[PDB]
Structures are given as C-alpha cells and as structure tokens.
Structure 1
Amino acid sequence: SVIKPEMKIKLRMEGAVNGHKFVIEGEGIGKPYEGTQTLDLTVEEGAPLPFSYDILTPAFNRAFTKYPEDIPDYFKQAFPEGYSWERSMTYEDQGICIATSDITMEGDCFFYEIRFDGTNFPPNGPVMQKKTLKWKSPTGKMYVEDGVLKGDVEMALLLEGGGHYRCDFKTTYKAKKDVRLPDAHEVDHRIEILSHDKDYNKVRLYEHAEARY
C-alpha cells in the first residue's frame, strides 16, 4: 500500500486565538501501523504565544493509529488522495475553537494545511493564564453518519493546583475518494509534549493512538 511502515510529516498551522495572529510549522516522523508519531514545532510568526500551548496540540492525523484487522481503516484507505477534517472544540468556560486540516501525501511524506481559530477565552482563564499541564488520556467514539465519519470525545485539561478544565470535541472526517466505511468503534489516545523551550517557540510533540471495539 502507499502507506509505508515509516512516514515523514510536514505541516504549517495558520490562525488566531483571541485576535492574536500566529503561524507555526513543523516536521516529524511516525509509524502509521503502530499509531505513534513525533513532531517538531516552531513558532515562525507571532511569538511568544499569550495563551496555553495545549489547545493547539490535538490540531497537530488519524492515519497514525493502530487499527485491528477486524475494523476497516477509514484513514489508511483514503490514501494517496488524502482526506480533510473539520472540528469544533467547546470549552466549559465558553471559550470556543474550530479548526480544519487538509492532509495530502507525496512519496513517503504527509503534508497538512491547518487553520485554527478561537475566541471568547476569559482573560483570566486557564487558557490565557497558561495554567495548563496536559490532556487527560481519553477514549473517543467514532461512528458513521451522513456517509461520512464523525468522532466525538470529551476532553479535559489538567490545571495547575489539580483542577480539570473540560472541552467537547466533535470532528467530521472526509475522505477524498470512496472507501469502506467502518463500524462504530472507539479510539484510545495519549498526547504529550516531551520537550519545549521557555515560551514554547520550540516543542516536541508525541501521540500514541490505538483503535478498538
């Protein structure tokens, strides 16, 4: 198949949060059949970032997931053409974010085109006040609807002091060609920042994801 056991990743994120315009880029490498990946992100425009870097991470490719044989892999089939996704991320304190991504491929490398926008985050919130530690590891629910794939997942950010800052995720995935739609299933995730400089102008991101019934 066009999906090699080892693939390179190249991305560019353009967007804004509470009016703050920014541009990020990155490169990495992962094992699609393993469901693991690592990325090196650098803020090319608009640093330092006035808001918590964690909100951006789930925006930085379900092709990097480990799919059991008995579940059609919607993501791997969509290639070499590729697919795109749209997502709404509503936070409990009314902060909202919506993002899109267009994923293509060339040889042994993925290329994403990402747009990320957010607004109405309270100035004294855990987001604007950078009190975020990381994302709890959740189980997201995939299911088909309207001939397309949808994923719903209740996310939560761990706050300094011990609190939990909740956010509802809802994504719509769209293959660019017809493929074998799967049965409703779950996806276990683990997203983590392994290293970063002071103001997060350089970050090393890692994710481990496996699908299951």
Structure 2
Amino acid sequence: VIKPEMKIKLRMEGAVNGHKFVIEGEGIGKPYEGTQTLDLTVKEGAPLPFSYDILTPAFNRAFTKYPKDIPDYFKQAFPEGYSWERSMTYEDQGICIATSDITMEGDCFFYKIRFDGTNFPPNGPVMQKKTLKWEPSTEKMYVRDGVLKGDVNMALLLEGGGHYRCDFKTTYKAKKDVRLPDAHEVDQRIEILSHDKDYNKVRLYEHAEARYS
C-alpha cells in the first residue's frame, strides 16, 4: 500500500484569535526513511496576524522511520487511513486544538486539517510574531483505550533567545483494526526551509525516526 515515495496534498481550515484562514499544500516524501517536504500556500486570511510555527506540527506519523521490532500503527492503518485529535497548551494560556482525517488513493496522501487557536495575548510571541523555530523533539508513544496516544514537551525558540513552551497531547485513531505497538519514542525535527514576506508561501521539512529508550 505505502509506496517508498509518497506525494502529499492537503487543505487546512481554521481560526486563531478569531482570524479565519485556509492553507492548501502539496508535498513529497519517503515514509520508510522518515522525512518529507511540503510547499504550503495561504489561500484565505492572508496576511496572517499570528506566527506560522504554531501551525507547522499540524501540517502525518506515517512519515516516520520505523524499525522492525516496533509495529507501525500508522503505515498498517492504510489504504483506509487514520485520524488524529491534538491539543497544544501554551505557557501563556494560549491554546490550540487541531484535527486531521488522513486518506489515500494511489501514491498520494490526502489531509483535511481543522485548526482552532485562542486566548493568545496580543503582546505575546505568537501574535507579535517573535517565534524563530521549534526546538527538535521526542514524542512519547503509548497505547491507551485501544488507540495510540502521544505526548511531547514542545518549545519554540524566540527572537532574542529564550524559549516558548507548549504541551502537546495527541490521539491517533486507525480506521481499521491494526497491531497496536508497545510504548516507544519518536525523535522529530520540523523546520521551515523557506518562506516569503508574510508566509503566504512556505516550504516545510520534517524528519522523524521511531525507537526504544
């Protein structure tokens, strides 16, 4: 089912501090090597009054390098696909919730992303656009209630040094019954390779490989 090189196509719709936006994206990656690229075009709500980094983790764990001794909950979930529900709690009470229904047909992955954000302070790093990048991270994967849960202590480096903390909690739900893995970790690194003046156009890179402690 999952080809060694899979094309990506998506559409994110949402609101941050009540600001409606729509972002379409087309990308390409290698799911077995755990890397992928995505070119994102802001279709609606441009210019964005908030930092683009807060959207980057919502823009697919199928694009993870999985060893043999660790069942791949994500790749096994296909052709049908899976879906995820994510909460992202910032240290300044600014909170985001996101969802994605991931489907497939041919060599292309398809996503429908819903992202909602609120209670970000006007003079904070997000709304003032003071965020430079997400520090690299490790997501703790464990099975709960028959589905896969993931937790990651995220942190955005800011303009002028210092970090901006976020607590991520995700629930991955396979559309079919699959072999549930035993608890593991996912080392990740997401980075915006290139962008324009207001991030109307963005190239985004991700690298993630799963392992045991």
TM-score (norm 2): 0.99
Displacement of 1:120 in angstroms is 0.3
- Secondary structure of the residue aligned to 1:56 is helix
Partner deviation per Cα, 1:64-99 (whole Å, 9 max, x = no partner): 000011000000000000000000000000000000
Displacement of 1:153 in angstroms is 0.4
The corresponding residue for 1:188 is 187
The corresponding residue for 1:33 is 32
Q: Distance in 2 between matches of 1:25 and 1:206?
A: 16
- Secondary structure of the residue aligned to 2:75 is helix
Q: Distance in 2 between matches of 1:148 and 1:33?
A: 22
Q: Distance in 2 between matches of 1:154 and 1:126?
A: 18
Displacement of 1:115 in angstroms is 0.1
For structure 1, the residue ranges without an aligned partner over 5 or more in a row are none
Partner deviation per Cα, 1:43-75 (whole Å, 9 max, x = no partner): 000100000000000000000000011000000
- Secondary structure of the residue aligned to 1:57 is helix
Q: Distance in 2 between matches of 1:118 and 1:28?
A: 25
The corresponding residue for 1:175 is 174
Within a 5 Å distance, the mapping from 1:12-161 to structure 2 comes to 12-161=11-160
Q: Distance in 1 between matches of 2:37 and 2:193?
A: 9
Partner deviation per Cα, 1:13-71 (whole Å, 9 max, x = no partner): 00000000000000000000000000000000010000000000000000000001100
Partner deviation per Cα, 1:111-164 (whole Å, 9 max, x = no partner): 000000000000000000000000000111000000000000000000011110
**Identity score, percent:** 95
Q: Distance in 2 between matches of 1:189 and 1:127?
A: 22
- Secondary structure of the residue aligned to 2:74 is helix
Q: Distance in 2 between matches of 1:114 and 1:139?
A: 23
The corresponding residue for 2:207 is 208
Q: Distance in 2 between matches of 1:90 and 1:190?
A: 19
Q: Distance in 2 between matches of 1:176 and 1:45?
A: 30
For structure 2, the residue ranges without an aligned partner over 5 or more in a row are none
TM-score (norm 1): 0.99
Aligned alpha-carbon RMSD (Å): 0.3
Q: Distance in 1 between matches of 2:204 and 2:57?
A: 10
Q: Distance in 1 between matches of 2:137 and 2:174?
A: 24
After the TM superposition, which segments of 4 or more aligned residues of structure 1 sit over 2 Å from their partners? none
Q: Distance in 2 between matches of 1:105 and 1:38?
A: 17
Count of aligned residue pairs for this structure pair: 212
